[PDB]
Amino acid sequence: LKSTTNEQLMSWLNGGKNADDVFKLLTLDDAAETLLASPQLQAWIKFMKKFNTENPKQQTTLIKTLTSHYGDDGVAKIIEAAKQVPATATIAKRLQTEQTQRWIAYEKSPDVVFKLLKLNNAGDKLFKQPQVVTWAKYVDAFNKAHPEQKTTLFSMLKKYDEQTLVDMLIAAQKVPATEKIAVRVQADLTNAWLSIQKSPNAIFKLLKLDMGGDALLESPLFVAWTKYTDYYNLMYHKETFPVISTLTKNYPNDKLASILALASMNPSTESLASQLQRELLENWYKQGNAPSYVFKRLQLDKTGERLFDSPILDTWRQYVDYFRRRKPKQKVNMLAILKEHYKDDGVLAKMLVEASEVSSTKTMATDLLDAFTLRWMYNRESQWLRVEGTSKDNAIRKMYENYDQL
Numbered sequence: 001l002k003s004t005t006n007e008q009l010m011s012w013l014n015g016g017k018n019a020d021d022v023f024k025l026l027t028l029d030d031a032a033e034t035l036l037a038s039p040q041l042q043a044w045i046k047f048m049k050k051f052n053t054e055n056p057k058q059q060t061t062l063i064k065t066l067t068s069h070y071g072d073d074g075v076a077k078i079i080e081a082a083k084q085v086p087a088t089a090t091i092a093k094r095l096q097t098e099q100t101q102r103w104i105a106y107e108k109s110p111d112v113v114f115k116l117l118k119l120n121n122a123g124d125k126l127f128k129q130p131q132v133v134t135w136a137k138y139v140d141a142f143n144k145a146h147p148e149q150k151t152t153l154f155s156m157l158k159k160y161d162e163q164t165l166v167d168m169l170i171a172a173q174k175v176p177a178t179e180k181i182a183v184r185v186q187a188d189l190t191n192a193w194l195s196i197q198k199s200p201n202a203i204f205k206l207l208k209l210d211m212g213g214d215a216l217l218e219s220p221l222f223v224a225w226t227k228y229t230d231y232y233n234l235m236y237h238k239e240t241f242p243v244i245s246t247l248t249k250n251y252p253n254d255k256l257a258s259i260l261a262l263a264s265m266n267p268s269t270e271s272l273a274s275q276l277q278r279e280l281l282e283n284w285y286k287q288g289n290a291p292s293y294v295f296k297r298l299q300l301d302k303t304g305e306r307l308f309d310s311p312i313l314d315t316w317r318q319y320v321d322y323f324r325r326r327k328p329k330q331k332v333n334m335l336a337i338l339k340e341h342y343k344d345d346g347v348l349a350k351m352l353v354e355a356s357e358v359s360s361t362k363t364m365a366t367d368l369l370d371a372f373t374l375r376w377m378y379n380r381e382s383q384w385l386r387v388e389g390t391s392k393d394n395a396i397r398k399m400y401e402n403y404d405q406l
Contacts, residue, residue: 002026004043013050019060020068022047029069036082036091056225063085063098072116075099076131098133099370100141114156126157127172127182136181144346145295154188162205165189170221190228200229201249210250217269217276243280254312256280261311277315289302291320291336294364301342307355307365319363336371346384356392373400380404 002008002025008045012022026040035041045062047216052059066075077100082092103113114120117131126132139151169189172182193203204210207221216222226243233240247256260280264273284294295301296311307313324332339348349372355365373396376383384406386397 004040006046009043009047013047013054019044019048019051019065023065029393032070032074032078033081036078036088037085054106056104061094061098064103066095066373072113073098073118073131076117076134080130081330082134096137099134100138103138104141104145110135110142110151111156114136118134119156124168127168127175129179131178134179138182152188153185154192155401157185162189166207190231193228194231194235197236200225200232200243201246203228204246204250213255213259214249215263217263217272218266242279244276244283247276248280248283253294253297257298257312257315261315277318280315281319284319284327285322291316291332292334292341293324294319295338303342303351307351307358307361313364333371336368336375338370349384353393369396377398 003024003186009022012025017025022044026044028035028038028040028044030039031040046061048062050063052248066078070078075095076099079096081090082088082095108116114135115122117129119126119129119132121136122132129316136153139153143150143152152321160168167181169186172178173186204225207225209219209222209225210214212219229241229243233242251259257277257280260273260277263269264277290296295316296314296331300306300310300313302318320332320335349369352365352369352372355361356369358365377400384399386393
């Protein structure tokens with residue numbers, strides 16, 4: 001409506017209008033979407049200065065007027081929205097400076113300001129409110145003045161369940177606006193946990209990592225918890241809980257080794273997985289017994305399509321070869337019988353035969369076939385078949401034949 005000329009504003013000022021009158025006339029109430037960029041606000045700033053001059057026993061400010069008309073919550077929301085539009089960014093910064101200055105003048109503590117900004121009622125949606133950012137920045141200001149102390153964002157957040165808080169942090173870390181803020185609160189929470197001896201297993205469960213398993217070493221939460229465990233163990237270096245302790249507490253040996261085996265396929269996790277396998281192997285040695293027991297532990301005695309899948313079989317053989325390295329006495333040809341505990345019909349030799357041409361399994365299959373040759377070489381068998389002429393089966397059978405004679 002009104003064109004905001006100097007001459008117009010002079011008319012108003014002499015006409016008896018005061019600052020809030022002109023605010024209402026320019027319709028800068030009910031314009032929170034637009035007022036920081038509108039030129040009506042600039043005209044009103046002119047009029048503010050000239051009114052201030054003529055009425056020296058009272059001062060009016062922009063910040064206080066916008067507060068009178070929108071509350072601290074509206075001014076905060078307006079500033080945060082305004083700094084998104086680049087044209088507004090400068091005035092937006094200047095207003096948020098003005099607001100925090102005002103709060104510090106009035107000796108408002110960060111928690112009181114937290115309540116003024118309707119954040120106490122945000123509930124699980126705390127970080128979806130734009131003005132949360134204002135609150136965060138205010139704390140920084142409150143901690144730059146007032147260096148006699150240091151106030152943490154977390155110190156206002158203990159109304160919450162820690163699991164719900166962690167969900168909120170995870171979600172807000174994705175949104176760029178509330179990204180570094182979420183990281184800061186997260187660091188605060190981690191330091192609190194460390195301060196109260198919160199065990200890595202406790203955090204592991206609290207992050208519901210004891211449930212999925214599927215690509216578990218790939219998860220963000222898993223990597224964050226591994227960081228937390230490095231922190232815990234560095235700080236409490238006498239009472240360490242290595243990752244393997246937790247993982248074996250929370251997963252069966254077979255499932256855990258399954259995770260490790262599958263996760264050594266992707267290079268991204270390969271290194272870590274191998275570490276863990278090594279550690280897992282140690283875990284078994286630290287207890288100690290029965291490579292056949294580990295075969296039982298691994299649920300591996302479900303043979304048939306045994307060699308084909310058993311992604312965990314390589315882990316069994318790894319354990320056997322580790323175990324030999326450190327316990328050379330105490331024979332390993334139980335390993336031979338380890339297959340034969342459950343078996344020793346033509347089915348086992350068959351399985352070995354099909355597996356001999358599986359590169360994955362070829363070395364192990366040839367080794368076990370050699371073991372058969374030595375076992376039924378103390379018998380007088382024949383044993384089952386050879387039906388090729390120049391096949392590896394042909395050669396093995398031929399020399400078993402011509403060795404039985406001597």
